[PDB]
């Protein structure tokens, strides 16, 4: 409509209506003109001793909007209300609006640096609906909307990696180039606005509960089994048997088995007592692809990193986060007090411990000449009758990941956590239109001289969630997340005297308990 | 409508629907104020030793839009899809939109050079529908919309040549002056937009196929002809005859003849072995008009420049292109590795070779006293029963040319390639309106003082194409264009580390094969 | 699926942007744990959502210029499965691996379909060299499928202590894990369209 008329209004709110909760979030963003209006080929050779580091790729003029973090949609008080009272939750609908656009021109004469409004300048916006572009949103990267509503943020620059030849910086014939300007886009002046709507596919609810029973202790404690086990051979080697007694969980027939495991090193925290002067990388867990060795830092699902009490943690099976945001490219060492370290101890009744060996199997054939022998195993994979619990979500953590298109997959739950989607919420791309500097003569060669410009505006995201209610018959009181501090010098989840937000603790979803 | 409202949106796309393909292209352009708002008489005398160089003409304040190149409408992947799967293609419809206009004023005080928006300034636009103006669009000149969508381009300045007297810079009484301001034009401020629509006349489809048979080898190989030839005279000079045998193509009666030829010099490429220190111009092919000798660098249709394998090329029968755009007025020498050189070797089954002699004819009357004699010929023209193939189109090359209005013509296919049209898509002309500097007194003499200004905006072109499907019964696999490179250091048809587009190879349309 | 992947399974993070996630890299002179942030483009050290498909190690033989070991009888060292008291060669191996890297003349022969250009007489016992044979390559699936000739990865074999340094061991076989992705074997014009699933009442992933 016009220079003097506002395109949209601020909405930041939560509404709770029975089985449904609606979240509204509004933020202010800034867009730089990246690459000076150009597409650049980007590449790397081996770095820090590793060829797994090498890649071939393109950097682009465009920027994108990322909302795949829970703190983007949820207040700390609203998150506490959900974890305390519900068995499960799932996403249903998404709505996005971009509005109140302002384009600015920056000029320097003799070091003055004046800044001014340009009314006739445009911004370009599009959504990748058919998934033609490479999707970089679900990989745990920075640049999402901020946890605190007043904070103002810079949009991330879009880029991708294609194929590389023989673990080197060079490309292959199969390697691909994608142009964003080939797709159609909306053009916006200061009066104009953009809107999009999405529906999520049917997905299973996340489980916000901890088991109240061990997988191996399900027989009644009072009653004996009608089943027998081999315990012995006599002086002539004749087989002998005994009945299975009540409460003897070590010797009982079992219907179901625990989930898959791979052994990972355990390190003590706090009082500790670990080995000195160690370089971690040579002894880390790895998988081999195309001739290179890769660390796979979240391990695959079905294990627990920490026992309960205990200060032993398997570090490569744990999500590690920082309380405060960091500057790009930092190489600084961080001690444990700075870090936020997660524990999966609630899943221990059904999930095997990562630091320990899995079990034992037979290695020989017994004979009158030879005694029977067993051996321990460090890895096991899926077996029929297998049961496990998936990794917990965090307020600091991601909601979704895109399933890769290969035509074959098994059990599609992402390792970091969250919901695995065949058709994920789509990539949203924004760029500043090139505006040319004074040109007085004709050339076939393309213009490289442009006026310097940046853009600013407001973004609103609305999300709908489906809730599963608790139906417990437990008489005694349950565990709950609480604000509990001894002699506090500051309020957590609040601004400080300088105005910086403080977030000391990581928050999971499992406080409620259910029988197996 | 307004200062804060956008006139149009970005559309860059291809849609394939059975027999029809639609192409959409969007670009950003810059317009200079050419000639400082004045019309100038332009002229030349003899240059580089030639009077064919002399001309008399006018230069104008206006600029024009040119779309007669395939890379303007076609992506490299889309062009590969057409050449691989279709017998023929033709143009059907054209739509043009000009929008998002921005007028800027440039001021200099003491070397500062400040640039600012002028809201009340106008741009003027018109189309030459009745072909009253001289048409300069179909002559292989620079200034067309760019191959890569992100590239920003300067519009070419309009000019023309009229009649000149006695191969000198002077005019004739028949010589003509044309004023653009005499035609009606639309006037546009920053809010305003312009649109045009065109329909192409019926034209024959281009042939995207190579012949699978020789013109002279069409008789069945197994069966003899019922026809006889003279082979001999006896000791008394009495005539003798022999029957024509199966597979003897050298001695067989023929229905049809090859197309017209003129001999052109052949030069070796690569390993080569050509003559040293040669100046080319004195020995080049020429046609004489109005007392001057002119090189005619594309030769006329019906010949082939290169045999297949072979490194001999007739250079004056070949389209030569540069991979990268060049600065105006360059006099630099270029070697073969920089150049993109085309081959017509697919048409060799029906088209005579340019470097070789055409054939032999009788030069005498035989008698008992005199033996019979023959002579070779270096040129031949159209004969009844003549068949030939027209020159191939290239992605780097032009779509159309205007047929000249003389009232008489034969077979109207242009020498460079493409479609010859009596009523071509029309000339589109744009100018910046003169805005005056401060005037304090009256004069009859016209104002020569104006504020300095330039314009910028977006242009969209939409084109519809009709396709002819392949109907082959060939059992074995065909030749296809492929991305095939050994040990590549860059991706072809992509930007580099500096952001410059790379286009190493020329691409033709003939990969499919058909029987004669 | 008649297509080849244009991206590696482990290279999906944006090359320009750093992760908000940290990894353990070190212990100090008193054995206290130390951490570093994950940087942009460092694919060796990045958190991963998805894992490659199942693998079993199979011997690799050079073709063309080659340079393989002389006078070998193949059968004793071949891959086998045991049924009802007997050892059986299982010549197509199970799905989720790639036989050949690209370029490279190393092929895992027991993971490859081998065909003859010409039909043969029944009962022939004749030796055939490589030039007579038609040998397939699965190099397009290498961005998501592990190589058969190479080891799969490494896992922890011990518990670290002030007395004991940490240790790892390589594995030659691995099976399906949750979050696993792979590509099935390609069809050929010379090859078969279909197979019947056996009736047992239980099966997994029937390709």
What is the C-alpha separation between B15 and B23, in angstroms, rounded?
A: 7
Helix (H, G, I), strand (E, B) or coil at C27: strand
Contact C136, C100 (CB under 8 A): no
The answer to whether the CB of B304 falls within 8 A of the CB of B351 is yes
Size of chain C, expressed as the number of residues it contains = 207
Name B436's bridge partners: B450
Answer for the pair A161, C7: CB distance below 8 angstroms, yes or no. Answer: yes
Taking CB atoms and an 8 Å limit, are A444 and B496 in contact across chains?
A: no
Whole-angstrom distance between the N-terminal and C-terminal Cα of chain B?
60
Q: How many CA atoms lie within 13 A of A371 on its CB side?
A: 2
Contact B150 A39 (CB under 8 A): yes
Calpha distance C145→C138 (Å, rounded):
9
**Gap between the Cα atoms of B431 and B116, Å rounded:** 19
Nearest residue of C to residue A314, measured between CA atoms = C24
Residue B194 is encoded by which pair of tokens? 């312009």
- Give φ, ψ of B291 to 5 degrees: 80, 5
Q: If phi over 0 gives left and psi between -120 and 50 gives alpha, with beta otherwise, what is residue A36?
A: left
In chain A, whose CA is at the least distance from the CA of B489? Answer: A170
CB–CB contact C8 A163 (8 Å): yes
Could you tell me which chain A residue has the CA closest to the CA of C9? Answer: A404
Which structural technique was applied? cryo-EM
Cβ separation A439–B154 shorter than 8 A: yes
User: Which helix H or strand E contains B4, and what residues bound it?
Assistant: none
Which of chain C's residues have a Cβ under 8 Å away from the Cβ of A57?
Answer: 15
Residues 477-496 on B with a CB inside 8 Å of A are 483-485, 487-491, 493-496
Q: Does A183 touch chain B (CB under 8 A)?
A: yes
C-alpha span between A425 and A401 (Å, rounded): 10
A92, B468, C189, C205 from C193: Cα distances, Å: 41, 33, 9, 17
Q: How far apart are CA B188 and CA B194, in angstroms?
A: 8
Give CA–CA dist A321/A319, Å, rounded.
7
CB B54, CB B164: distance < 8 Å: yes
The residues near B201 (Cβ < 8 Å, ≥ 6 apart) are B421, B422, B423
Map residue A76 onto helix, strand or coil.
helix
Q: Are B69 and B496 in contact (CB under 8 A)?
A: no
- Rounded Cα distance between A177 and B76, Å, is 11
Residues in Cβ contact with C127 at an 8 Å cutoff, skipping those fewer than 6 apart = none
* C-beta neighbour count of C186 within 10 angstroms: 15
Among residues B162, B167, B164, the alpha carbon closest in space to that of B292 is found at: B167
Q: Give dist(CA B317, CA B480) in Å, integer.
A: 25
CB contact (8 A) between residue C17 and residue A142: yes
Interface contact flag, A269 C33, Cβ < 8 Å = yes
Reduce the DSSP state of residue C162 to 3 states and report it: coil
The per-residue DSSP string of A354-420 comes to SSS--EEEE-S---SSS---EEEESEE---TTEE--PPPP-SSS--EEEPP-SSEESS---SSSSEE
- CA B86 to chain A, closest CA, distance in angstroms equals 24
d(C-alpha B299, C-alpha A428), whole Å: 53
Residue that has been written with the tokens 């028949």 in this structure: B174
Q: Is the CB of residue A508 less than 8 Å away from at least one CB of chain B? A: no
Backbone dihedral region for residue A71 (phi beyond 0: left; psi -120 to 50: alpha; all else: beta):
alpha
Chain A environment of B497 (Cβ under 8 Å): 40-42
Q: What is the C-alpha separation between B393 and B414, in angstroms, rounded?
A: 11
Give Cα separations from C57 to B246, B327, C54, C149, C151 (angstroms): 63, 60, 11, 6, 7
Written as six digits, the tokens of A60 are 């682009």
Quote the CA–CA distance of C130 and A144 in Å, as a whole number: 56
Compute the distance between CA of residue B250 and CA of residue B252 in angstroms, rounded to an integer: 6
> Residue A397's closest CA among C17, C19, C16, C180?
C19
Asked if C143's CB is within 8 angstroms of A163's CB, the reply is: yes
Q: Please, which chains are in contact with C (at least 3 CB pairs closer than 8 A)?
A: A
Residue ranges of B 67-106 with Cβ closer than 8 A to chain A: 75, 100, 102, 104, 106
Whether residue C173 lies within 8 A of chain A, CB to CB, comes out as no
Q: What are phi and psi of B461, to 5 degrees?
A: -120, 130
The answer for residues whose C-beta is within 8 angstroms of residue C99's C-beta and 6 or more apart is C107, C108, C111, C112, C136, C137, C138, C148
Give the whole-angstrom CA distance, residue A285 versus residue A259. 19
Tokens representing A300 are 């695959």
**Which residues of chain A have a CB within 8 Å of the CB of C39?**
329
Q: Are B516 and B211 in contact (CB under 8 A)?
A: yes
Size of interface A-B (CB pairs under 8 A): 162
- What's phi and psi for A184, nearest 5 deg? -70, 140
Assign B236 to helix, strand or coil.
Answer: coil
A contacts of C142 (beta carbons < 8 Å): 290
- Tokens 């003097």: give the residue: A4
Contact yes or no for C184 and A407 at CB 8 A: yes
Q: Which residues in chain B have their CB less than 8 angstroms from residue A122's CB?
A: 6, 100
Exposed, middle or buried by CB within 10 Å (0-12, 13-18, 19+), for B18? exposed
- Residue A233 and residue B39: Cα distance in Å, rounded? 117
Q: Does B108 touch chain A (CB under 8 A)?
A: no
User: Helix (H, G, I), strand (E, B), or coil: what is residue A283?
Assistant: helix
Phi, psi (deg, nearest 5) at residue B382: -60, 140
Q: Which residues contact B272 (CB under 8 A, 6 or more apart)?
A: B311
How far is B194 from B125, CA to CA, in rounded Å?
8
Q: Which of B298, B354, B23 is nearest to B139 (CA)?
A: B298
Chain CA centroid to CA B485, Å: 28
Give the H or E element holding residue A448. Answer: none
Angle at C95 between CA C199 and CA C111, to 5 degrees: 115
CA atoms within 13 A on the CB side of C68: 17
3-state secondary structure of B367: coil
Tell me the H-state helices in B189-318. Answer: none
**Which residues in C119-136 are b (16+ Cβ under 10 Å) and which e?**
eeeeeeeeeeeeeeeeeb
The owner of tokens 């911004």 is A123
The answer to whether A275 contacts C164, with C-beta atoms less than 8 Å apart, is: yes
**Closest chain B C-alpha to A178 CA, distance in angstroms:** 9
- According to DSSP, the residues that pair with B478 across neighbouring strands are none
Which of B15, B128, B29 shows the shortest CA–CA distance to B429?
A: B128
A386 Cα to chain C: minimum distance (Å): 12
Residue of B nearest to A170 (CA): B489
Interface probe, candidates A182, A186, A188, A191, chain B, greatest B C-beta count within 10 A: A182
Residues of C in contact with A334 (CB under 8 A): 22, 34-37
C-alpha to C-alpha distance for B83 and B507, rounded to whole angstroms: 9
* Chain B residues inside the 8 Å CB shell of A112: none
In 3D space, the residue among B83, B91, B80 whose CA is nearest the CA of residue B466 turns out to be B91
What whole-number distance in Å separates Cα of residue A28 and Cα of residue A14? 19
Could you give phi then psi for residue C44, rounded to 5 degrees? -60, -35
3-state class (DSSP) for residue A82: helix
- Chain centroid offset of residue B199 CA: 21
Are the C-beta atoms of A302 and A410 separated by less than 8 Å?
A: no
Q: Are strands B453-469 and B206-207 parallel, antiparallel or unpaired?
A: unpaired
Angle at A165 between CA A160 and CA A167, to 5 degrees: 90
**Tokens at B100, concatenated:** 């998002």
Q: Which residues pair with B123 in a beta bridge?
A: B188, B432
Spell out which residues of chain A touch residue B190, defining contact as CB-CB under 8 Å. Answer: 120
Rounded to the nearest angstrom, the gap between the alpha carbon of residue B437 and the centroid of all alpha carbons in its chain is 44
B256 and B215 in contact (C-beta within 8 Å)? yes
DSSP 3-state assignment of B41? strand
- CA–CA gap between residue B511 and residue B86 (Å, rounded): 10
**What are the residues whose beta carbons fall under 8 Å from the beta carbon of A470, sequence distance 6 or more?**
A85, A86, A87, A512
Is B317 an 8 Å CB contact of chain A? no
The residue among A405, A391, A330, A398 whose CA lies nearest residue A135 is A405
DSSP per-residue string spanning C94-115: PSSEES--SS--EEEGGGS-EE
- Residues of C within 8 A of A415 (CB-CB) are 47-51, 179
Query: What are the structure tokens assigned to C160, written together?
Result: 């670290």
Contact A95, A190 (CB under 8 A): no
| Tokens 């870090």 found at | A339
Q: Please report, for residues B273, B308, B310, B336, the alpha-carbon distance to residue B270 in angstroms, rounded to integers and kept in the order given.
A: 9, 14, 10, 8
Beta bridge partners of C181: A409, C52
For residue A139, the tally of other CB atoms under 10 A from its CB is 22
DSSP state of B508: -
**Taking the CB of residue B299, how many other CB atoms lie within 10 A of it?**
20
CB contact under 8 A, A289 and C9: yes
Proportion of chain B in helix, strand, coil states, percent, rounded to 5: 5, 35, 60
Length of chain A: 516
User: Which of C5, C21, C23 should one mutate to test binding to chain A, selecting the residue with the greatest count of A CBs within 10 A?
Assistant: C21
Half-sphere exposure of B169 (CA within 13 A, CB side): 7
Which residues contact residue A358 at a Cβ distance below 8 angstroms, ignoring those fewer than 6 apart? A261, A263, A352, A376, A377, A378, A379, A380
Report the DSSP beta bridge partners of residue A360. A376
Query: Shortest CA distance to C141 belongs to which of B285, A174, B266?
Result: A174
Partner residues linked to C191 by β-bridges? none
Contact status, residue A267 vs residue A336, Cβ threshold 8 Å: no
- Beta-carbon count within 10 A of B17 CB: 8
For C19, other C-beta atoms within 10 Å of its C-beta total 21
* HSE-CB for A187 with a 13 A CA cutoff: 22
b/e burial code for range A185-218 (CB count within 10 A of at least 16 → b): bbbbbbbbbbebebebeebeebbbbbbeeebeee
- Angstrom CA distances, C103 to A226, B494, C106, stand at 63, 24, 9
Minimum-distance CB partner of B151 among A41, A175, A446: A446
First to last CA, chain A: 60
Nearest to A295 by CA among A307, A306, A283, A305: A283
Give the H/E segment covering residue A446. Answer: none
Query: Which residues neighbour B283 within 8 Å (Cβ) at sequence distance 6 or greater?
Result: B265
Eight-class DSSP state of B144: B
Q: How far apart are CA B495 and CA B497, in angstroms?
A: 7
Distance of alpha carbon C156 from the chain centroid: 21
A321 shares contact with chain B (CB less than 8 Å): no
Q: Does A451 touch chain C (CB under 8 A)?
A: no
Contacts of C179 (CB under 8 A, 6+ apart): A300, A301, A410, A411, A412, A413, A414, A415, C49, C50, C51
Residue A511 has φ and ψ, to the nearest 5°, of: -125, -30
Burial of A248 (0-12, 13-18, 19+ CB in 10 A): middle
Three-state secondary structure call for residue A12: coil
CB A486 within 8 A of CB A468: no
CB A204 within 8 A of CB A90: yes
On chain A, the residues whose CB falls within 8 A of the CB of B151 are: 446
Residues in chain B: 516
Residue C144: strand, helix, or coil: coil
Alpha-carbon distance A144 to A158, whole Å?
Answer: 13
Spatial distance between the Cα atoms of B359 and B378, rounded to a whole number of angstroms: 8
| DSSP 8-state assignment for residue C44 | G
């Amino acid at each position: 409509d016009g220079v003097g008329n506002a395109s949209g209004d601020w909405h930041c709110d939560s509404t709770w209506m029975g089985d449904r909760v609606v979240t509204k979030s509004t933020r202010t963003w800034v867009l730089p003109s990246y690459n000076n209006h150009q597409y650049r080929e980007i590449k790397s050779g081996s770095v820090d001793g590793s060829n797994a580091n090498a890649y071939f790729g393109y950097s682009t003029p465009w920027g994108y909007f990322d909302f795949n973090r829970f703190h983007s949609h949820w207040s700390p008080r609203d998150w506490q209300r959900l974890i305390n009272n519900y068995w499960g939750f799932r996403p249903r609908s998404l709505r996005v609006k971009i509005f109140n656009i302002q384009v600015k021109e920056v000029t320097v004469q003799d070091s003055t640096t004046t800044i001014a409004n340009n009314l006739t300048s445009t911004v370009q916006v599009f959504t990748d609906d058919d998934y033609q572009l490479p999707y970089v949103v679900g990989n745990g990267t920075e640049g999402c909307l901020p946890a605190f509503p007043p904070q103002v943020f810079t949009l991330p620059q879009y880029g991708y990696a294609t194929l590389n030849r023989d673990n080197t910086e060079n490309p292959t014939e199969r390697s691909s180039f994608f142009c964003l300007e080939y797709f159609p886009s909306k053009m916006l002046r200061t009066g104009n606005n953009f809107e999009f709507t999405y529906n999520f596919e049917e997905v299973p609810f996340h489980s916000s509960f901890a088991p109240s029973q061990n997988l191996f202790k399900l027989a009644n404690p009072l009653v004996d089994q009608y089943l027998y086990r081999f315990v012995s051979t006599n002086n002539t080697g004749g087989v002998q048997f005994n009945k299975n007694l009540a409460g003897r969980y070590a010797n009982t027939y079992k219907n179901w088995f625990p989930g898959p495991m791979g052994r990972t090193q355990g390190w003590n925290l706090g009082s500790g007592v670990n080995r000195a002067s160690v370089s971690a990388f040579a002894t880390t867990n790895r998988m081999e692809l195309e001739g290179a060795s890769y660390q796979v830092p979240p391990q695959p699902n079905g294990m627990t990193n920490n026992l309960q009490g205990s200060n032993t943690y398997a570090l490569e099976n744990t999500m590690i986060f920082n309380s405060q945001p960091a500057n790009p490219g930092t190489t600084a060492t961080y001690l444990e007090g700075n870090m936020l370290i997660t524990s999966e101890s609630e899943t221990q009744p059904v999930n095997r411990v990562a630091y320990n060996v899995g079990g034992q199997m037979a290695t020989n054939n017994q004979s009158s000449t030879t005694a029977p022998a067993t051996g321990t195993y460090n890895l096991q994979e899926i077996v029929p009758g297998s049961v496990w619990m998936e990794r917990d979500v965090y307020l600091q953590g991601p909601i979704w990941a895109k399933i890769p298109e290969t035509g074959a997959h098994f059990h599609p739950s992402p390792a970091m956590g969250g919901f695995g989607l065949k058709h994920p919420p789509p990539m949203m791309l924004i760029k500043n239109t090139p505006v040319p500097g004074n040109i007085t003569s004709f050339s076939d060669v393309p213009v490289s001289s442009f006026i310097t410009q940046y853009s600013t505006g407001q973004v609103t995201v609305e999300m709908e969630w489906e809730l599963k209610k608790e139906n417990s018959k437990r008489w005694n009181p349950e565990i709950q997340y609480t604000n509990n501090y001894n002699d506090p010098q500051f309020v957590d989840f609040a601004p400080d005297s300088t105005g910086e937000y403080r977030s000391t603790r990581p928050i999971g979803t499992r406080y409620l308990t259910r029988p197996l």
